Design a protein around this ligand. Structure first.
Ligand SMILES: CCOC(=O)C1=CC[C@](C(=O)OC)(c2cc3ccccc3n2C)N(S(=O)(=O)c2ccc(C)cc2)[C@@H]1C(=O)OC(C)(C)C
Length: 369
């Protein structure tokens, strides 16, 4: 782990001191040059509902990305074009799919994705980590004080789903700043320092689970399953787009990319790595849907000495308990997630993700010392 100074990790990892892997204070407006993109993105609910979306997209002029001159404007553009792309491909979600993304959006979207080293599909870092604003800049980051920037359909519960996910990410990321202390304490054989750091990590993971509970208040299972999940769906292994999507004017052949998926959150991969919990091929591939600087942090973490090995070599009840408090918090999170998928996907579908989630939960449980 590269350090900015004796206390803080390098700014090159683009991890914020307050919101972690989330984008700090995302841009809400693009340069005037891109007004036509912003109009479509801001009106996706009424444009999809009225069947006007695809014709509006097909009438767009091709706009150069050269006027997106900084990271935040580029991230906002990616979010805008990603949401338009999912709306264009899936339409109203009844099977009337489009297999070709028109060049007037495919080319700038793919060029921008190339510049940020992200796939040209909507990812977690777009629709959660960059898709938010504070209502009152002087009040804290709570659901009541926040909004999303874009939604897909009225009633899709995108605000509830995206913001609760974001607040879970922010709660858990509070422990990232303790990570340099973990490794310093191991190198200096500071038992009490390591114990207290692990307890702080456990506390943050426990808080993150309490925040996730808010999902029930702001997301209804039927709306999530039947509507929102449509626009998070990708074109990898998808029988409706079995060869992928044609990005007109960028590649001649169709290309497959996964939609929103488990494993795209950097902060939970980070504590899986830190605690040695590290299905596996799927999670490795999902790192490539993460911003590249966040991948680099995960990779630097994997190159550090093993916390788990340190705790094992010691034979120290307090360290075992503090380590297990972190693992137990992850077990509780994954058990809760299994119940969420049951309520929000399985039961609605009744009226493979689970075997995957059971495998991860079992791996986590088997890491208890
Ligand atoms: C109602 C369905 O609820 C979920 O299944 C998720 C909700 C949140 C989240 C996430 O980031 O939370 C930290 C996620 C939302 C989201 C949106 C777009 C793209 C990626 C996203 N991800 C990863 N995750 S989660 O990390 O694994 C997680 C889950 C539970 C707990 C207790 C902790 C962590 C999953 C998830 O995969 O959503 C998908 C498949 C993409 C539905």
């Amino acid at each position: 782990i590269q350090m900015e100074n004796s206390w803080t990790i390098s700014k090159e990892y683009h991890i914020d001191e307050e919101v972690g892997f989330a984008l700090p204070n995302p841009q809400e407006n693009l340069p005037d040059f891109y007004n036509d993109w912003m109009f479509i993105a801001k009106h996706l609910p009424d444009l999809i509902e009225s069947g006007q979306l695809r014709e509006r997209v097909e009438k767009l002029n091709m706009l150069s990305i050269d006027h997106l001159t900084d990271h935040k404007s580029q991230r906002l553009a990616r979010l805008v074009l990603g949401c338009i792309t999912m709306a264009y491909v899936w339409g109203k979600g009844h099977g009337d799919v489009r297999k070709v993304l028109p060049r007037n959006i495919a080319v700038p979207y793919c060029q921008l994705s190339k510049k940020l080293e992200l796939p040209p599909i909507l990812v977690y870092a777009d629709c959660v980590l960059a898709n938010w604003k504070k209502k009152d800049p002087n009040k804290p980051l709570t659901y009541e004080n926040m909004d999303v920037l874009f939604s897909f359909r009225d009633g899709d519960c995108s605000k509830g789903f995206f913001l609760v996910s974001l607040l879970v990410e922010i709660a858990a990321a509070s422990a990232i700043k303790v990570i340099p202390t973990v490794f310093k304490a191991m190198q200096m054989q500071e038992r009490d320092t390591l114990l207290k750091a692990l307890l702080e990590i456990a506390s943050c993971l426990e808080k993150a689970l309490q925040v996730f509970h808010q999902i029930h208040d702001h997301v209804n299972p039927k709306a999530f399953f039947s509507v929102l999940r449509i626009y998070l769906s990708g074109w990898k292994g998808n029988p409706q787009l079995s060869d992928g999507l044609v990005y007109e004017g960028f590649w001649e052949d169709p290309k497959e990319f996964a939609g929103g998926s488990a494993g795209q959150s950097s902060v939970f991969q980070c504590f899986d790595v830190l605690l040695g919990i590290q299905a596996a091929q799927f999670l490795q591939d999902m790192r490539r849907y993460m911003p590249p600087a966040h991948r680099n942090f995960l990779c630097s973490l994997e190159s550090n000495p093993s916390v788990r090995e340190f705790v094992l070599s010691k034979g120290d009840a307090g360290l075992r308990e503090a380590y297990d408090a972190c693992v137990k918090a992850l077990v509780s999170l994954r058990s809760y997630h299994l119940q969420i998928v049951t309520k929000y996907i399985l039961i609605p579908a009744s009226q493979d993700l689970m075997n995957f989630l059971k495998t991860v939960r079992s791996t986590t449980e088997k890491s208890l010392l």
